[PDB]
Amino acid sequence: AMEVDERPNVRYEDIGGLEKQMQEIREVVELPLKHPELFEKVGIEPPKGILLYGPPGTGKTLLAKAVATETNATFIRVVGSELVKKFIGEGASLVKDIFKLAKEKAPSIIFIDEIDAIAAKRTDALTGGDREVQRTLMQLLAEMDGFDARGDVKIIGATNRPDILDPAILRPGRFDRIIEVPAPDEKGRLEILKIHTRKMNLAEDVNLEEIAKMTEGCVGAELKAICTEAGMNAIRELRDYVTMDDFRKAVEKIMEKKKVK
Numbered sequence: 001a002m003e004v005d006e007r008p009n010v011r012y013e014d015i016g017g018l019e020k021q022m023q024e025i026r027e028v029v030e031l032p033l034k035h036p037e038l039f040e041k042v043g044i045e046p047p048k049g050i051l052l053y054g055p056p057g058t059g060k061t062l063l064a065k066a067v068a069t070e071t072n073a074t075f076i077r078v079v080g081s082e083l084v085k086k087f088i089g090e091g092a093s094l095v096k097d098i099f100k101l102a103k104e105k106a107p108s109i110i111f112i113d114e115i116d117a118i119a120a121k122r123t124d125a126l127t128g129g130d131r132e133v134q135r136t137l138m139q140l141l142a143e144m145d146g147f148d149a150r151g152d153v154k155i156i157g158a159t160n161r162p163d164i165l166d167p168a169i170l171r172p173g174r175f176d177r178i179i180e181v182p183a184p185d186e187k188g189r190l191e192i193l194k195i196h197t198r199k200m201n202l203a204e205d206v207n208l209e210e211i212a213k214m215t216e217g218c219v220g221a222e223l224k225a226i227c228t229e230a231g232m233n234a235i236r237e238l239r240d241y242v243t244m245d246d247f248r249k250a251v252e253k254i255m256e257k258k259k260v261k
């Protein structure tokens with residue numbers, strides 16, 4: 001299955017701590033989408049597909065939505081694993097309907113979450129089981145090498161497991177840009193903290209700088225959760241405003257939850 005969102009609502013001012021990878025996408029998919037005739041006359045060939053790596057909850061989906069919003073393209077999220085049907089032609093079939101729908105509601109960004117589900121290189125020619133998943137993988141590449149000219153429909157792939165990937169896919173004329181989207185540094189965390197606390201009622205004791213410092217290697221999704229946990233501590237103590245203290249308890253909770261070793 002695929003989840004469709006015609007006009008997503010994600011703006012770049014809301015994606016923290018990815019200044020460079022944000023710019024790279026902007027110019028490597030947004031710009032081509034906006035100005036195909038320009039890319040044409042200037043000379044350079046834009047990517048048909050771009051691939052995003054790194055941990056889960058880092059903002060990969062986010063960026064894609066963000067591009068989809070800045071371009072009023074139909075956002076199309078494809079759940080990688082959900083394409084692993086164990087029946088003849090069933091996987092490939094869904095890929096077809098997905099491109100059918102991407103063109104029908106073009107412009108559109110197809111963001112495929114976890115393509116390593118489909119595009120993992122197996123182990124060898126004792127394929128059996130994942131011979132069918134190969135039938136699907138081939139279907140995708142067909143659609144790609146296929147319809148694609150410049151930019152009316154763009155494809156973004158995402159994985160947190162890039163060396164499992166099949167070189168076949170990384171070939172030019174497919175996913176040839178591969179951007180890392182990493183857990184953010186300290187500087188990064190703070191921006192993300194500023195974004196998610198932007199609509200909440202913070203007490204004047206709340207040193208955000210401090211909490212960014214407290215959250216070694218959390219991801220944007222985990223930080224988002226911290227903000228909504230801190231608020232709930234306030235609610236729990238029937239308040240109206242969120243305290244430096246609340247956050248220390250949120251951080252503390254989420255960091256242990258993270259230590260699932």
Ligand SMILES: Nc1ncnc2c1ncn2[C@@H]1O[C@H](COP(=O)(O)OP(=O)(O)O)[C@@H](O)[C@H]1O
Nearest residue numbers: 014015016056057058059060061062220221224
């Ligand atoms: N860099 C970030 N900036 C702002 N919000 C983020 C960031 N990373 C994660 N989030 C929050 O967590 C959610 C999950 O991000 P998403 O892009 O879906 O994760 P993934 O990188 O796995 O695609 C986002 O909707 C956003 O609210």
